[PDB]
Structure formats: C-alpha cells, structure tokens
Nucleic acid binder design. Structure first.
Ligand SMILES: [Mg+2]
Ligand SMILES: [Mg+2]
Ligand SMILES: [Mg+2]
Ligand SMILES: [Mg+2]
Ligand SMILES: [Mg+2]
Ligand SMILES: [Mg+2]
Ligand SMILES: [Mg+2]
Ligand SMILES: [Mg+2]
Ligand SMILES: [Mg+2]
Ligand SMILES: [Mg+2]
Ligand SMILES: [Mg+2]
Ligand SMILES: [Mg+2]
Ligand SMILES: [Mg+2]
Ligand SMILES: [Mg+2]
Ligand SMILES: [Mg+2]
Ligand SMILES: [Mg+2]
Ligand SMILES: [Mg+2]
Ligand SMILES: [Mg+2]
Ligand SMILES: [Mg+2]
Ligand SMILES: [Mg+2]
Ligand SMILES: [Mg+2]
Ligand SMILES: [Mg+2]
Ligand SMILES: [Mg+2]
Ligand SMILES: [Mg+2]
Ligand SMILES: [Mg+2]
Lengths: 262, 230, 53, 180, 126
RNA sequence: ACGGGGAAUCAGGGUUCGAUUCCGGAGAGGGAGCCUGAGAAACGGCUACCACAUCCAAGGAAGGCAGCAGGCGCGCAAAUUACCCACUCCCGACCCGGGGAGGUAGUGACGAAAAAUAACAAUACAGGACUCUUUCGAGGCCCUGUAAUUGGAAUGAGUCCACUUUAAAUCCUUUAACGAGGAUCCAUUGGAGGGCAAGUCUGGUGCCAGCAGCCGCGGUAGCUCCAAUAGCGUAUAUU
RNA sequence: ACCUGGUUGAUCCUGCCAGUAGCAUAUGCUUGUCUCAAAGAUUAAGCCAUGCAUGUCUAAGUACGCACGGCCGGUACAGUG
C-alpha cells in the first residue's frame, strides 16, 4: 500500500466481537484512540449488537448525536470510538452504567455497575519519567498522563482515578499475594492470586497465578492487571468470578445438585 | 369442531372466553359473546379428562392415562408439563391462581404448585382399600373440589363417604378433617361461592362407565350444609 | 406409460419379484380356517432335508 | 468479496461395484417395502449410516475412561435415542455397531403415516403427504423424507384444513354437488 | 360461526434513546390471507390506546401452512419523534415523504456535464 | 515459479494442486523521471523516449478498461452497455451529501439440496404361473393373466384477484374463483434383442447363408428386456 | 497365492493386454416445480467505441450576483443562497 489502510474485512475482525458472516463484507474499523485496535470494543458494536438499542448503523448515529452516551464521564459522538478494558459507559436516559470487563470466555461482558462505582476507574501504570522543570509524569494503559504522582508508584502498579477530576486517589502495588486479572493470551479473563514472578533479563518475565479453586497457570508480565489488594477486588466482578470451569467438574456440580435435590 | 367427545369446560373468570378439551387430545378456545372460534392447542398424548380455569388467561388439564398435568399459558404460547402420581388422572381443580389439586384412579390425591414440576404433597389411598383378600386395590377418586383462596379440600369416591381435607402451610401436607356419610359414586363436587354449603352429585354408576353399579344409591343432588363455629 | 413415473415403475418390479420368488420358496401362512388337507398332492418320495456331515 | 456462503456437501455416493446381484436384490427389497422413488434415496441413507458407524468404531478404538470417548459417545448415543433408532436401555457403542438401514428407513414420515393407520398403503401415504393432508403438531409437513423424532411420533394427524381432517370438501365434491 | 384475527405481542421493550416502544407482532388468521398492514395498525392502536399515525409495522412473514404471521412493530411517543427518527421509506409508505423522481444515470451525466463549465454558467447546464 | 492460510487423495507416510472473494508482495501497454503531500517514484497525476492510436481548416490538439457493463482478437459465435445507496462499511466542513466498494434482480443442467408425472375400490371372462436345469429332466401352487370394463374421492402444473415481501420490485410463503380418465395436462438418455414381402445385392452346400429391408403389383386419401432417472452419453489426456 | 481374467512339456524371468472407480478439457440428446452457489485461462500483463466508477458545509473561515427576499430611516451586516 501507499499509505494507511481505512477498511476492515468482516472475517478479519477480532473474534471476540461475535460478528456473523452473512451480514456484510465489512466490519467497523475502530478510530485511533486510547486503546489498541485488536483489544477494543467499538461503540457501534456495544450499542447495537450487545444491547440491541439500535437496529442499523444509522440509528447508532442518531442515538450518539443526541449526546446521550458518555464514556469515562465525557460525551462521545464518534460511533467507532475504541472503548477498552476498565472503561465506564454511562447512559443517563435509561439510568444505566456499564464497565467493560472480560468474562471467562475472553469477551467483553455486559456488566452493570452501581452509580457510586461509576465515579472511578483502575489504570495500570505503563511509564514513569521526569519532564520539564523536574516534574514527575506517569503514563497509564489508556494513554492518560498524570503530573505529580506519588513517589511510591512504580511501573506495573495499579492506580484508582476519579473520573471527574482525573486525579489519583490511591494505588495497589505489584506484589505476590495481590489479586490480578489476565488481559491477554490463553488465560484471558481469569482472576487469581500472584504466587511468584520469574525474571528473564533482556526478555519477557513470567508470572504464576492461582485461582480460588486451586488451579495454577502462568502468563507473561504484560498480560496481568492488578485488581485488588489481598483477595478483595477493588471493583465489582461479573457473574463468573474469574474461574474457568471444565466439563468434568460441571458434571460434578450438576451431580451434586441433583443429589441434594429431593 | 371437536373430533371426539367433549370432556372438560370452563369459562375464564370475569370474561365470556370459554375453554374446551376433548378425547381428541386438543384444547380449543372460544368467545361466546361473539360466537366465534379462536385457536387450537396440542400436546397431550392421551384423551384429556378434566379442565379448569380462573381469572388469569390460563387453564390446566388432567392428562388421564398419559399421567401428566399440563398448564397452558395462552398469550405467552408456552406449555408447562407436570409429572405426578401413577394411574389415570381423572379430575383436577384450582385452589388459587398458583395451586391446584388432582385425583387419580389409584386412590392418590396430590397438591400442586404451578411453579414446580412435582407434587408438593401426595396422599396415597385417600379413601382406603377394597377387594377380596390378596387382591385388594384402593378406591378410585372420581371428583375433587377446593374452596377458592382457602385451605379446604373435598374428595369423592365410591367408598360411601365424602372426605374433607386441610392443606398445610405451603400446601406441603394434606390432613383429614371428617367424613360425611353418603352412599354412591360422588361424581361431582362444587363449593358454594360464599362457602356455606357443598353440593355433591351422587349416582349409582361412575360418570364415565358402568364398571360398578351400587343398588343402594339414589341418583340425586345432595346439598351438604357447612356450618362454621370459631 | 409405466416408464413415465420412476416410482410406480419400481412398484411393479417389486410386485413381479414376489411372484417369481413363489417358485423358489414357500410362503408362511396361518391356520385361518380349520385344517382340511393340503389342496395339492402329498409327495412321499421327494426328500428336501439338508445333509449334515 | 461477497456476502454469500459456499458451504455445501454431497449426501450420497454411487456404489463401488456396479454389477452385483446381491446389491441389486437388496435395493429392490428396500425400495419395494418402503415405497421409495429410486436408488439415490437408498444411497443417501446408506451414506448417513456409514458415517454414524464409522464414528462409533473410531470411538471404540479408544480407552473407556478417555474424556473424548465419554463426551462424544454420550452425544452420539443421545442423538440416536432422540431420533428413535436406539432404545433407552441400549445406550452403548456396541448397539450403535448393531444398527441397520431399515431402522433409519422406519423413521421416515411416509412409513410412519402408513403404520399409524392414516393411510392404507405406503404409496397412499406418500401421496397423502405430498398433497398437504398431514400435520405434525401445528405444522403441516409435505416432505416424505421427514425424519420423525421420538416425541413427534404421537402428534401426527390430519391437518385441520384437510377434507379428511374436518375441513371444507374438495374441488371434486363441490363440483359433483353442483351437478346434482 | 365466525373466524377471528388475533393479535399478540412479544418481546416488548421501551427504547428511551429513540423515544419509542418496540415489539414482535404475531397474527393469527387461520382461514384468510395475510392481513394488510393498515388493519394491523388500527387493531394495534385500539390495543395500545394510541392513534394509528405513530405505529410503524414491517417485516411480516407468513409461515408455511398459513396459520400465523410474524412481523415487527414500533410505537412512537409523538408524531414529531416519528418524523425525526424513522427511515425515509417507512415515512413514505405513510405518505409523509416524497423522493426524487429521477435516476442515477441522469444525475451522474448532469454532474459530469457541469464539470466542464466554470463560473456562473454552471447554472445553465441542462 | 506471485508466497502463505488452504483443496484433493490416502492405513500411514507422503503425492498432486493453490490465477481465484482472508493475509503479504508487485504492476497499471514498455523502459526511465518528477510535482504536491504526513504518506506516492501515484498513472480514473504530470514530463520526455519506444510502440500503438483519435480529431484537424494541416498550423496544431487530445489519449491508456490487468475498475463496472460492453465490443474485438482470419469466416466459426455463450452473463446485463439493468435498478439502488434501503443493508455492510468508507470519505467529507458533514446526523442530512457522495460511493459500478458493496447490495438487488437478469443470464448455458458447470456444481450442491429438496421433490411431481397419480392414489384407492369394483366387475367380467379365461387356465395356467414360477424356480433350478447346456435341447434330456426335477420341483411347485390359498393364484396368475386379459393394449378387458366400471365408480366417485384427492391434488397441483397452469389461468387469474387481492395481500405479504422490498429502496421500488421480482421470487418464496398466505389466499378467493377456474383447473384430470387415453387423468392425450402423454420422461428422457445409454445398452441389448425379436418380428416381415410376388422387395434389392453378394456368395454358395438343388429348397441355403450373409448383409439388410417405410423402396412390393395397384393405389395417397405407438414391439420387448436391462442400467440410471430430471437426468444421461461420447472423444482426448491422465490418476 | 496382496483383485478378476490372458501371453509355456514343467518351473520361472523380462516385455505386455482386457475389466472395474475418479479428476481435467471439449462436446452432444433431454430439461415440469423449487432453494443455494459459480462464472479465469491463444505463455494474448494482447487491442479497445460509448457511458459511468470521488467528492465534500455546520449556529460556528470568506456573500455588496435583487438570484430571491422581511423590516425599515437607523443604514456596517435580517434571512436563504
Ligand atoms: Mg489497494
Ligand atoms: Mg473508521
Ligand atoms: Mg421421480
Ligand atoms: Mg509467471
Ligand atoms: Mg494464491
Ligand atoms: Mg503502484
Ligand atoms: Mg491492455
Ligand atoms: Mg495531507
Ligand atoms: Mg507511474
Ligand atoms: Mg483506467
Ligand atoms: Mg488508482
Ligand atoms: Mg470490463
Ligand atoms: Mg470472436
Ligand atoms: Mg449506503
Ligand atoms: Mg446518504
Ligand atoms: Mg463489483
Ligand atoms: Mg441445451
Ligand atoms: Mg450437460
Ligand atoms: Mg456452462
Ligand atoms: Mg443435483
Ligand atoms: Mg407494496
Ligand atoms: Mg374414473
Ligand atoms: Mg436371405
Ligand atoms: Mg510371457
Ligand atoms: Mg465548522
């Protein structure tokens, strides 16, 4: 090509969007934004495919141009806006608040949250650097840059940000024993406790996690998002608590329920 | 429009909408005020024995030899199937909008809740046993009745008595009150609207056939006065 | 005209095949009337048993 | 780029040896007993049964406690019981290996209509189905090769609009009544 | 004995973002043909106690055998919201919108003819 | 010899295909050069050369379908110069405009799925089926056969109203009235057999055989069997 | 003795023949109803008539075209364009 591409074929779209094959040739190419193309949920997909509020793209445009949808407290009129992990979507007309959280199947789930929980979000620290006039700066996973952070905050930590002001309220350190969620790879959407961390210089670190049922798994350091301090998460969790269940143990729980009935 | 004998009829309470069932295994909906036919429903696998309805747009049917009780959600176009006592289910009656009672030809009486797939209570041999030694079988249940929005249940057989029952808390237990001596087949039982008396249809034979004949019985309508003292 | 419809053509082939089979083998029949004889001969010199050796 | 689908498959295979007396005799017997149209209808069912029995044999090549064997064998046995070819008491892979083609031929709507007494012949049953006289529950079905499930078997009857099902008399009756 | 047309509603939900109520419509007409959309609109207006001008129905498919039909319906809060939110062809089916009485070929040729003239004389191209 | 994801065939191992709707590369008749721009060595941009080729008042001027339709490529030959931005998405100052990208219909049995051309009863008259057997013979019957008659039920191919569908339509699905006895409202393709005169040719073993036979003295007003079945053959190459 | 049949006094070797199913190319006779899909190829990336295939404005960059227009002596500019 002689320049940037502007289209996206429907069969080449990310698989977690759950798009069918016969609707059309194309898929919505997300706009540039805070989140990456392969790890985002465009506003049109969330608004007409997940919630069924609209039937076509024109109705999505009509809904958005009435300034009804707010993302992280700000009105967005772009229907291909890339919304990502730990984003807050507010619709005051229907009195609804949503937070984008992976389910155990590796897909963004329709997760409704209380209006008091809608006032803050969690962000993973990506970079720390000293800018002009010796002012410390912190860069998060959703391209937020924050001045004058706490000196105790380092890379791979988690911060809680008030959406109205965009300022840090408190933070969770990256340590063994804290609760974490997997944001990529084969174990995407699984919640557990960090057990130990393996360091490889000049390469990728590997972290081991164990969930509530005792199952253990391992991922790369870049695929882990610290959620809570200790075992208590700082956000509400979806219907599954991060436990990926197998067919055998599903049969086991069905047998237990059948035995307990009667 | 029915292709066999009509076996059950009930008006929807408060309207002129009528439901009919038949031995042709179908349920039909009519509107009497507009003398018009509405629709036909299917799902039973044998001849249907009884039908009852109330204020809600819904009816319940007894499956007879099929051994099931079915609930018809007509505007929702849905069907609920309940599996209960052994033997043919010959009679059924609604207690309220959520509970109902049925009787079977193996002597059993069952209490149902419209949100659970099994009987809440099951009283086996409600009217006792009969027959020669070594060949004894329980009396068939011919009619059941319930007083609307209360816990009083009446059951009728050919055991020469009419029995009154109490539904327990949560309809999980059935308890006998008293016996009213009445000779013959108790083919029909209906409580009064006020609840001051109970009407029993008495015959020398069962309403569906001539398997028995009781010579001592009189083909009569019996009015049983119920007197309440706290 | 039978060749026009393949289904009825196959129907006639089955009807004839059962007729041709009657020469080889005897069809099983019930005693729907009181037994009154064979209606054909009884041959006493023909032996149909299968020799086992 | 188009928004169409190219997914398709064949449902039968022509026989490997084209001149076998036993094969021709078996086809003649099946077509005659079940009132089929041609050889392709037999070959279709033979193809289906071959797929099922190959899957059963491949599952039987595995260990009994293999999770894949348990999962896929249970799924296959449940499907076979649902369509009515197996019995609830015969839920093993060996009984799948025991299956024949007549068992599948008995589940067609054409033979079901004849065996339930709605028609007096197998060809009469085919004609009745093709002329929209037969209903399964609410639905009117005019496909002779409709495979009747276990639960649907008790709900096969004449359609409500049919002259045999209490509907309006047909063209010939009305014309003959108009004549006289 | 009379036959009846029965209207049933399913999957009712209230869309506050587009100011309407939308549902699936089932029509029972055992002996007759497919019921026209106008009569369905009048019956649904009587059912929901509104005027027929705010009801828009479409997508009616009759099942094989001829007993039942299934379609989709929307009821708007007001006629202004309907004129503002509905697609233009559904408004035209009610007589509220009128489209261009021309073809793509004519417009394209007229545009390409205008490309050759500069200035005010662009208005003189036929 | 564009590469890959992949397709076919196999017990496996492999082998043969992959221009072709997804990803990556390359080109815009051929070799070179360049402007603008964040991004081009761009061709529905520009400059010169080579090859083609249109108009001209002969001075000059204008070009690039390996985009969508469509035409040509000795005389011999195969999709429409169709409708629309309603869906999917893209571009713009933009909720609104544009889009042969895409969508909708049309067009050679090239490929895949379902599926008609009939069903049910009755009457009369005859005495012979059928199987195995290299011309001999052995078994066998609750029927068979008749280009024989008879009856009043069912239905869609079609004709023709109205809805429904859709951007507008068509198709499919509903539905009123017509619509069957040679139900002539008549299924085909390949293979293999029989039947004949004052007829023709050729060869002989007097009276025979071969090939074949709508052709005869006159005269001119719809046999059988087999394989598949809406499908079924042939040639070349090959596995 | 790794399919069924042929090429010998006997036993063999080497060259061979016929039958059985598919893929590709070209081509016939027939084709009542319906659903889905496809459409390249002269080592010619050979040549092309005609039409179309890329344009775009919000309250919010620039209107002294009466092009059309309300209110007027307040008269820099109403508004559409
Ligand atoms: Mg490109
Ligand atoms: Mg975009
Ligand atoms: Mg056929
Ligand atoms: Mg090459
Ligand atoms: Mg390729
Ligand atoms: Mg290029
Ligand atoms: Mg060229
Ligand atoms: Mg630029
Ligand atoms: Mg160039
Ligand atoms: Mg071009
Ligand atoms: Mg280009
Ligand atoms: Mg072209
Ligand atoms: Mg040519
Ligand atoms: Mg568009
Ligand atoms: Mg537009
Ligand atoms: Mg195209
Ligand atoms: Mg042809
Ligand atoms: Mg062909
Ligand atoms: Mg072709
Ligand atoms: Mg085919
Ligand atoms: Mg219309
Ligand atoms: Mg006749
Ligand atoms: Mg001769
Ligand atoms: Mg040799
Ligand atoms: Mg602006």
């Amino acid at each position: 090509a002689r320049g940037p591409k502007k289209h996206l074929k429907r069969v080449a779209a990310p698989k977690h969007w759950m798009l069918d094959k016969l609707t059309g040739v194309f898929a919505p190419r997300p706009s540039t934004g805070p989140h990456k193309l392969r790890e985002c949920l465009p506003l049109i997909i969330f608004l007409r495919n997940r919630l069924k509020y609209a039937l076509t793209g024109d109705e999505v445009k009509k809904i958005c141009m009435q300034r009804f949808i707010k993302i992280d407290g700000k009105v967005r009129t772009d229907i291909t806006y890339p919304a990502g992990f730990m984003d807050v979507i507010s619709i005051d007309k229907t009195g609804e608040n949503f937070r984008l959280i992976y389910d155990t199947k590796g897909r963004f789930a329709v997760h409704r949250i209380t209006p008091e929980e809608a006032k803050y979000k969690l962000c993973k620290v990506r970079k720390i650097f000293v800018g002009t006039k010796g002012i410390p700066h912190l860069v998060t996973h959703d391209a937020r840059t924050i001045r004058y952070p706490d000196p105790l905050i380092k890379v791979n930590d988690t911060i809680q940000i008030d959406l109205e002001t965009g300022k840090i309220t408190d933070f969770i350190k990256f340590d063994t024993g804290n609760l974490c969620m997997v944001t990529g790879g084969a174990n995407l959407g699984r919640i557990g406790v960090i057990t130990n961390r393996e360091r490889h210089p000049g390469s990728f670190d590997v972290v081991h996690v164990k969930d509530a049922n005792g199952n253990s798994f391992a991922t790369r350091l870049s695929n882990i998002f610290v959620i809570g301090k200790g075992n208590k998460p700082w956000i509400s969790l979806p219907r599954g608590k991060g436990i990926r269940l197998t067919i055998a143990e599903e049969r086991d729980k069905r047998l237990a329920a059948k035995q307990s009935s009667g | 429009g029915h292709r066999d004998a009509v076996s059950g009829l009930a008006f929807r309470r408060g309207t002129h909408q009528l439901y009919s069932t038949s031995h042709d295994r179908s349920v039909k909906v009519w509107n009497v005020a507009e003398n018009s036919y509405v629709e036909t429903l299917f799902g039973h696998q044998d001849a249907v024995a009884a039908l009852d309805a109330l204020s809600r747009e819904c009816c319940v049917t007894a499956g007879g030899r099929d051994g099931t009780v079915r609930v018809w959600k007509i505007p929702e176009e849905s069907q609920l199937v309940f599996y209960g006592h052994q033997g043919s289910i010959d009679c059924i009656h609604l207690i309220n909008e959520e509970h109902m009672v049925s009787g079977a030809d193996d002597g059993s009486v069952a209490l149902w809740g419209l949100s659970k797939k099994r009987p809440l209570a099951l009283q086996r041999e409600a009217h006792g046993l009969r027959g020669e030694p070594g060949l004894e079988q329980p009396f068939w249940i011919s009619s059941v009745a319930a007083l609307l929005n209360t816990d009083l249940v009446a059951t009728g057989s050919h055991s020469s008595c009419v029995r009154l029952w109490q539904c327990g808390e949560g309809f999980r237990q059935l308890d006998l009150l008293c016996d009213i001596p009445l000779v013959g087949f108790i083919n029909s039982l209906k409580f009064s609207s006020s609840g001051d008396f109970l009407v029993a249809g008495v015959g020398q034979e069962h309403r569906l056939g001539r398997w028995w004949r009781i010579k001592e019985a009189r083909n009569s309508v019996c009015i049983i006065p119920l007197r309440r003292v706290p | 005209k039978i060749d026009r419809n393949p289904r009825v053509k196959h129907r006639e082939k089955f009807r004839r095949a059962k007729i041709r089979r009657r020469g080889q083998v005897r069809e099983v029949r019930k005693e729907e009337q009181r037994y009154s004889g064979e209606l054909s001969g009884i041959r006493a010199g023909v032996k149909k048993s299968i020799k086992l050796k | 780029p188009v928004a169409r689908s190219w997914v398709c498959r064949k449902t039968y295979v022509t026989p490997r040896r084209p001149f076998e007396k036993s094969r021709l005799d078996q086809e003649l017997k099946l077509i005659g007993e079940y009132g089929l149209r041609n050889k392709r209808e037999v070959w279709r069912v033979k193809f289906t049964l071959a797929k099922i029995r190959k899957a059963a044999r491949e599952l039987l090549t595995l260990d009994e406690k293999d999770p894949r064997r348990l999962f896929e064998g249970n799924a296959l046995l449940r499907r076979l019981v649902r369509i009515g070819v197996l019995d609830e008491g015969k839920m093993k892979l060996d009984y799948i290996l025991g299956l024949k083609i007549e068992d599948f031929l008995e589940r067609r709507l054409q033979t079901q209509v004849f065996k339930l007494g709605l028609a007096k012949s197998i060809h009469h049953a085919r004609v009745l189905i093709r002329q929209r006289h037969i209903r399964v529950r609410k639905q009117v079905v005019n496909i002779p090769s409709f495979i009747v499930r276990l639960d649907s078997q008790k709900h096969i009857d004449f359609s409500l609009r049919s002259p045999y099902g209490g509907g309006r008399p047909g063209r010939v009756k009305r014309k003959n009544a108009k004549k006289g | 004995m009379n036959d009846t047309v029965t209207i049933r509603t399913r999957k009712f939900m209230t869309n506050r973002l587009l100011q309407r109520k939308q549902m699936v419509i089932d029509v029972l007409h055992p002996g007759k043909a497919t019921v026209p959309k106008t009569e369905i609109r009048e019956k649904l207006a009587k059912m929901y106690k509104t005027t027929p001008d705010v009801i828009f129905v479409f997508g009616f498919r009759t099942h094989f055998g001829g007993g039942k039909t299934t379609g989709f319906g929307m009821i708007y809060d007001s006629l202004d919201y309907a004129k503002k939110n509905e697609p233009k062809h559904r408004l035209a089916r009610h007589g509220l919108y009128e489209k261009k009485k021309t073809s793509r070929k004519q417009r394209k040729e007229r545009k390409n003819r205008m490309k050759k003239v500069r200035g005010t004389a662009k208005a003189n191209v036929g």
